[PDB]
Amino acid sequence: ERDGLFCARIFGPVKDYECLCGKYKRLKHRGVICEKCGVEVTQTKVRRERMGHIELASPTAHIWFLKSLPSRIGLLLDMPLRDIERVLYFESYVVIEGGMTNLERQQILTEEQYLDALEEFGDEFDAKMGAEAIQALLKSMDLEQECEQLREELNETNSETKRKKLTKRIKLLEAFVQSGNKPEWMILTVLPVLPPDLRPLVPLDGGRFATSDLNDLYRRVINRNNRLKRLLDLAAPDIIVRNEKRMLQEAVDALLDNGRRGRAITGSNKRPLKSLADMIKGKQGRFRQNLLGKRVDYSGR
Amino acid sequence: KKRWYVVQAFSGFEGRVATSLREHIKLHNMEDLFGEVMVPTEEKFFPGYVLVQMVMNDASWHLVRSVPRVMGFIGGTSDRPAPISDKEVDAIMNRLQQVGDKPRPKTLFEPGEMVRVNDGPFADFNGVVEEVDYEKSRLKVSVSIFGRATPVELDFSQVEK
Amino acid sequence: HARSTGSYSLVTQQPLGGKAQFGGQRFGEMEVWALEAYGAAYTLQEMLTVKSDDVNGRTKMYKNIVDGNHQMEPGMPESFNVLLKEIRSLGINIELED
Amino acid sequence: RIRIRLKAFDHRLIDQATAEIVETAKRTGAQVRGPIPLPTRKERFTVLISPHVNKDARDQYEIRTHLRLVDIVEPTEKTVDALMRLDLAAGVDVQISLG
Amino acid sequence: AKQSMKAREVKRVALADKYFAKRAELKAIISDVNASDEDRWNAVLKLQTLPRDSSPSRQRNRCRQTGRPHGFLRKFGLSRIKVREAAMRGEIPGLKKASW
Ligand SMILES: [Zn+2]
């Protein structure tokens, strides 16, 4: 498909040193890209190393940093997991540097809490929701400032429980400053797609293609992202784009680690389909099944 | 006064959901509690949502969710689900066809030299269009897909930018 | 069953499994532990880089065996590059330093 | 229906092209209309052949542009890619037109 | 022809290419019966102001090889003499001596 998931220009030519469509059938000009083909010109294994990226219309926070126990965004923004998910699934609002009003920065807001505030603080007031709001919070979170505060808080208290609760928060706050990891990199904005060769589309004996599960996951994320771009073109009302961004959030969260959210999606028939984290973890991931133990030539039985 | 609400159906069975909804209204004869049922259509937004003129009693809420192939309302909460707006209805009344208007009675997709033909006999490939007859709705795409490389009078809708 | 050099799988460039598919026996995890338990280091290196996964390594190996050489050019397992692409396809940025 | 207008200066070449096109059509699709010969354009030119002066001294040249009208009545799926890999011989301007 | 003449011709062509949109517009304005008198006058004056070489009726068709003003043919862009030579050599496609 030009240009779909399994593109030509974005990745490479199926055949080795061939424009899939039609030009270069010898070994002279390896690289030329005509307008009739919109195709690169390299090796058959070149697509296995090349990866694509999906421009997610609406920001979506990572599931590995939101539900890892303890969550990476749970002990960093000083907010309970329950409240973090509420806002993340378009079910709660979050304040962000309101101004001269009677409201905190971490404190959340509900429909009734926002409605009344909307008519009250109609001017200088900011109260978003979802990953966008979360991203802002993380983005506008002076790491260094928190360190001293946390450090001073730990030296000005005697509470055993608090001490352990403060030492676990300051440990992940100073470790982030030691490296080049930003707080706004937790939310996924430019979702990456695994190489086609690594998500292979081979037909079994017959005339149909036995498709992998990751192609279902990526194809749903792209279907939803196209729908969300079209609705933000058309200026749909608030509840439509909240459901649309929420379905995109759940689609991305299902692509990365399926089933960590409520009941896992399924294609055929009731069995859930296998995601990227389920290509890593488990007895049948890459470590325990292809890197620690391998199948071996020059062997017999 | 009847205000609007948004219903989610199984996307694809939407006309059958609308018909079954009208029939459940005329079965349980709460005729004074329902005004219309909208599925708008362009020459189809919205992709899977049914608009209902309604009032909010819990009986009518159970009625709409007891209509088959309906998931539920979409709002702030499930106790008191949310109507949409009214200030954006005045601007929508003046314009109800922004994705198919006569504002640009010519170019539907930038011709230039990057288009693909799929409608009609010739299909699936692509060519470079030098001149174009927008007035008479004609294109001179020298698509080299079907044949050598001659300009084949194609239709704007038949081709794709 | 016996296999010198047969077909290779598609997603991870390792030999196929079974007998009907002309395949090679799984040098499993506990056998890797049992070769770590000796001092056999080159046997394990060719047992999981040359004989199994690395495609340029095994074509260099086949030329070197039919010419009498008896030498391996090691390289990298291609399935480790598959691990890099699967971890990298998340929001995670895994690399190889230096 | 696909009308095809072959135009060329050499007649033999044009004929060859036409046949090829027919072949391309006929294997994939069905009911090719036929190779209908339209009128030839004989665009003539007179010129003075002297460098300076001698007006009755003249050469009269011409370019015979031949036309071949091939039509295809049923455009199938496959018929569209029948002539995709088969570009025609050089010096023959083709002009396909569906409908 | 001379080099100089050729150069001049080229310049004229360039000018024509440049000033076409404006000149055409001006002409249209001048023509347009449903228009103000003063406006028309202005247009007429405006045209005068523009360079003379900007006019397409200024440039002469010369032979593309020799620059010979006379004996020109449009189809070939060549003067008769050169055209004949081309024909003889086989360089003009399709062209052969005609008899009837
Ligand atoms: Zn090409």
CATH number at residue D69: 3.30.70.600
Q: Do E83 and D91 count as a contact with CB atoms less than 8 A apart?
A: no
Give the DSSP H or E segment for D65. strand D58-72
Q: Do A51 and C88 count as a contact with CB atoms less than 8 A apart?
A: yes
Place of tokens 């047969």: C6
The number of helices, as runs of H, and strands, as runs of E, in chain E is 4, 3
- Contact status, residue D72 vs residue D25, Cβ threshold 8 Å: yes
- CATH number, domain of B51, equals 3.30.70.940
Q: What spatial distance separates the first Cα and last Cα of chain D, rounded to whole Å?
A: 5
D2: which residues sit within 8 A by CB, 6+ positions away?
B121, B122, D71, D72, D75, D79, D96, D97, D98
Q: Distance (Å, rounded) from C-alpha B6 to C-alpha A291?
A: 51
Contact status of A238 with chain B (Cβ, < 8 Å)? yes
Q: Distance (Å, rounded) from C-alpha E52 to C-alpha D1?
A: 52
Q: What spatial distance separates the first Cα and last Cα of chain C, rounded to whole Å?
A: 44
Which residues share a beta bridge with B127?
B115
- Contact status, residue D15 vs residue D40, Cβ threshold 8 Å: no
- Contact status, residue C82 vs residue A296, Cβ threshold 8 Å: no
What are the percentages of helix, strand and coil residues in chain A, rounded to 5? 40, 10, 50
Contacts A–C by Cβ distance under 8 A: 119
**Ranges assigned E (strand) in chain A:** 52-61, 93-95, 108-109, 127-128, 187-193, 202-203, 209-210, 294-295, 299-300
Q: Angle at the Cα of B138 (from B134 to B143), degrees rounded to 5?
A: 120
Give the DSSP H or E segment for A175. helix A160-178
Q: Distance (Å, rounded) from C-alpha D47 to C-alpha E81?
A: 8
Tokens found for residue E3 = 């080099």
Amino acid, res. C96: L
DSSP summary character for residue D88: P
- Contact status, residue C64 vs residue A177, Cβ threshold 8 Å: no
Contact status of C5 with chain A (Cβ, < 8 Å)? yes
Q: Distance (Å, rounded) from C-alpha A296 to C-alpha A147?
A: 52
- Measured in residues, chain B has a length of 161
Q: Distance (Å, rounded) from C-alpha E13 to C-alpha E60?
A: 10
Residue A19: φ, ψ to 5° = -80, 120
**Contacts with A2 from chain B: Cβ below 8 Å:** 116
In angstroms, what is the span from residue A280 Cα to ligand 1's centroid? Answer: 37
Q: Do D98 and B150 count as a contact with CB atoms less than 8 A apart?
A: no
- Is residue E41 packed enough to be buried (19+ CB in 10 Å), middle (13-18) or exposed (0-12)? exposed
**What per-residue string of b and e applies to A59-92 under the rule 16 or more CB within 10 Å gives b?**
bbbbbbbbbeeebbbbbbbebeeebbbbbbbbbb
- Contact status, residue A170 vs residue A147, Cβ threshold 8 Å: yes
Nearest CA in chain B to A113: B76
DSSP summary character for residue E56: G
B13: which residues sit within 8 A by CB, 6+ positions away?
B69
**Ranges assigned E (strand) in A179-293:** 187-193, 202-203, 209-210
- Contact status, residue A20 vs residue A39, Cβ threshold 8 Å: yes
What are the percentages of helix, strand and coil residues in chain B, rounded to 5? 20, 25, 55
Place of tokens 């009078």: B153
Place of tokens 């939101």: A66
Q: Distance (Å, rounded) from C-alpha A109 to C-alpha A129?
A: 9
Q: Distance (Å, rounded) from C-alpha C82 to C-alpha C59?
A: 20
Q: Distance (Å, rounded) from C-alpha B16 to C-alpha B10?
A: 10
Q: How many domains does chain C have?
A: 1
Residue A289's SS3 state is helix
- Measured in residues, chain A has a length of 301
- Contact status, residue A108 vs residue A77, Cβ threshold 8 Å: no
B8: which residues sit within 8 A by CB, 6+ positions away?
A243, B48, B49, B50, B70, B71, B72, B73, B74
C32: which residues sit within 8 A by CB, 6+ positions away?
A292, A293, C44, C48
Q: Indicate whether C35 belongs to any domain.
A: yes
Tokens found for residue A196 = 């086609």
Q: Distance (Å, rounded) from C-alpha B126 to C-alpha A37?
A: 9
Instruction: Say whether the peptide bond before residue B46 is cis (omega within 30 degrees of 0).
Output: yes
Give the DSSP H or E segment for A118. helix A111-120
**What per-residue string of b and e applies to C47-73 under the rule 16 or more CB within 10 Å gives b?**
bbbbbbbbeebbebbeeeeeeeeeebe
**Contacts with A231 from chain B: Cβ below 8 Å:** 46
Residue A275: φ, ψ to 5° = -100, -170
Q: Do C89 and A194 count as a contact with CB atoms less than 8 A apart?
A: yes
Q: Distance (Å, rounded) from C-alpha D74 to C-alpha D84?
A: 17
Q: Distance (Å, rounded) from C-alpha D34 to C-alpha D72?
A: 8
- Contact status, residue B70 vs residue A104, Cβ threshold 8 Å: no
Residue E34: φ, ψ to 5° = -85, 70
**Contacts with C29 from chain A: Cβ below 8 Å:** 288, 292-293
**Contacts with C87 from chain A: Cβ below 8 Å:** 280
Residue B93's SS3 state is helix
Q: Distance (Å, rounded) from C-alpha A206 to C-alpha A180?
A: 51
DSSP summary character for residue A266: B
Residue E40: φ, ψ to 5° = -60, -45
DSSP B33-63: GEEEEE-------STTEEEEEE---HHHHHH
Q: Which of C45, C20, C26 is nearest to C35 (CA)?
A: C45
In C1-98, alpha helices (H): 29-37, 42-45, 55-66, 78-88
Residue A203: φ, ψ to 5° = -85, 145
Q: Angle at the Cα of D61 (from D58 to D66), degrees rounded to 5?
A: 165
- What separation in angstroms does the CA of D68 have from each of A241, D11, D65, D93, D94? 58, 10, 10, 11, 9
In angstroms, what is the span from residue C16 Cα to ligand 1's centroid? Answer: 35
Q: Distance (Å, rounded) from C-alpha B96 to C-alpha B92?
A: 6
Q: Distance (Å, rounded) from C-alpha B42 to C-alpha B97?
A: 7
Contact status of C36 with chain A (Cβ, < 8 Å)? no
Place of tokens 């495609």: C55
B41/chain D closest Cα distance in angstroms: 30
Residues A261, A265, A269, A275: is their CA dihedral positive or negative? negative
In angstroms, what is the span from residue A300 Cα to ligand 1's centroid? Answer: 46
Q: Which of D18, A90, A294 is nearest to C14 (CA)?
A: A294
Neighbours of E84 (CB within 10 A): 20
Q: Which of A267, A163, A185, A262 is nearest to A219 (CA)?
A: A267
| Resolution, Å (one decimal) | 3.7
Q: Distance (Å, rounded) from C-alpha D48 to C-alpha E81?
A: 7
Q: Looking at chain D, which subunits does it touch, using at least 3 CB pairs closer than 8 Å as the criterion? A: B, E
**What per-residue string of b and e applies to B4-25 under the rule 16 or more CB within 10 Å gives b?**
bbbbbbeeeebeebbebbeebb
Q: Indicate whether C7 belongs to any domain.
A: no
- Contact status, residue C78 vs residue C12, Cβ threshold 8 Å: yes
Q: Do B122 and D93 count as a contact with CB atoms less than 8 A apart?
A: no
Strands A93-95 and B70-73 come out as unpaired
Nearest by CB: E84 against D49, D62, D65: D49
- Contact status, residue A125 vs residue A94, Cβ threshold 8 Å: no
Q: Distance (Å, rounded) from C-alpha C27 to C-alpha C14?
A: 12
Residues C46, C52, C56, C61: is their CA dihedral positive or negative? positive
Q: Angle at the Cα of C58 (from C56 to C62), degrees rounded to 5?
A: 120
- Domain of residue B51 covers 1-98
Q: Distance (Å, rounded) from C-alpha A108 to C-alpha C89?
A: 33
In angstroms, what is the span from residue B96 Cα to ligand 1's centroid? Answer: 44
Neighbours of B151 (CB within 10 A): 21
Place of tokens 């071996």: A296
Give the DSSP H or E segment for A138. helix A130-139
Residue A184's SS3 state is helix
DSSP B96-113: S-SSS-SSSSS-SS--TT
Which residues share a beta bridge with D46?
D60
- Contact status, residue E78 vs residue E61, Cβ threshold 8 Å: no
- Contact status, residue C1 vs residue C21, Cβ threshold 8 Å: no
Give the CB-side neighbour count of residue D9, counting CA atoms within 13 A. 10
Amino acid, res. D50: S
Q: After which residues is chain B discontinuous, taking C to N > 2.5 Å?
A: 43
Instruction: Say whether the peptide bond before residue A3 is cis (omega within 30 degrees of 0).
Output: yes
Largest interatomic CA distance in chain B: 68
Q: Distance (Å, rounded) from C-alpha A260 to C-alpha A282?
A: 14
Residues of D in CB contact (< 8 Å) with B are 2, 4-5, 75-77, 79-84, 87-88, 93-99
Q: Distance (Å, rounded) from C-alpha A30 to C-alpha B160?
A: 29
Measured N-to-C along each axis, helices A143-155 and A160-178 cross at an angle, to the nearest 10 degrees, of: 150
In angstroms, what is the span from residue D83 Cα to ligand 1's centroid? Answer: 17
Measured N-to-C along each axis, helices B58-66 and B14-27 cross at an angle, to the nearest 10 degrees, of: 130
Q: Distance (Å, rounded) from C-alpha C9 to C-alpha C52?
A: 11
- What separation in angstroms does the CA of E94 have from each of D10, D61, E63, E91? 7, 10, 20, 9
